Amino acid sequence: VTASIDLQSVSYTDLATQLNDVSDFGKMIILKDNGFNRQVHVSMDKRTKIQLDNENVRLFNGRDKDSTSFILGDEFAVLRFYRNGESISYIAYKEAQMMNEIAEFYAAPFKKTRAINEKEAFECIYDSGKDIVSVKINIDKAKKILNLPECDYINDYIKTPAVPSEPKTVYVICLRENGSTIYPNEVSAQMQDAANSVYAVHGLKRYVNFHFVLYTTEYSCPSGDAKEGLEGFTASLKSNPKAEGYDDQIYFLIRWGTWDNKILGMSWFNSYNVNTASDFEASGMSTTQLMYPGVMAHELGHILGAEHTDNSKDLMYATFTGYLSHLSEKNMDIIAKNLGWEAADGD
Ligand SMILES: [Zn+2]
């Protein structure tokens, strides 16, 4: 009988035992809910590495037709999949107190809202007896219910100032802003979407493997202004003797919130090229909250040379779309060029 995940009671140990059983050749898992049954073929993501404060975080993919992915650390696990065109995340933390804190955190925006549809946007999942074992979040339904202010990207980038035998490792050094609380499920999802938006372009996993690390920085933005915040962040990287000799990597300042004018992130445009990266120029900033998936991917796009497009299904649309993929062939060419690819190499 095929392994299955019961979405009416899914816990951290459920997800951990299933994903830890995924070998080199993949594993079939059936996702189950009321009137819902989806068989997905799960595989380990060997392209991307993540440590959060030296804690190792592993990624998992479904087939394209599955619209499913996973995240697993020692402390938490994530299942995210699409149903009826809407993303749904199941977020499970191992320790009971941190699960309770996470559940209360995600319940906060609904504390004045009563919809009688609230459970379709946010729901605590209970063990099969009143202990929360995960939370289920549908951010599209949450946005419809909450009718909150919509942040965006307008003016989110400034101007500066034979296939290889092995992909080049590119470190993406993420720095938790001084005073920020970042939850591991949220930042890991942003990193996963960012790396995957690049691999999907011109077969770029042949050329790059991203390695994310997260640490805390003493830097914090001096005002609410994103441009001033990014200028200060890059200056703080050059001032820091710790970072001597890593000026050719990519850097993100991350926070849970946003900046003035509902700005979601900011980056130096067209600032990374595998052959010339230097002087901490490939740097940006990004929110990490769950309601804005793909902001890190969008900013990484700009760093790699991608422009805004007029296609509202594109990751690089000038206002927030929630979509996670590059659709502009013009953007794909410059991203791939800056990562070492040439047309003669094919896809
Ligand atoms: Zn942008």
From Swiss-Prot:
EC code: 3.4.24.74
Presence of the UniProt keyword Hydrolase in the record: yes
UniProt keywords, alphabetically: Hydrolase, Metal-binding, Metalloprotease, Protease, Secreted, Signal, Toxin, Virulence, Zinc
EC top class, as a word: hydrolase
UniProt cross-references to SUPFAM superfamilies, sorted A to Z: Metalloproteases ('zincins'), catalytic domain
Any one GO biological process: proteolysis
One Gene Ontology MF term: zinc ion binding
Protein name: Fragilysin
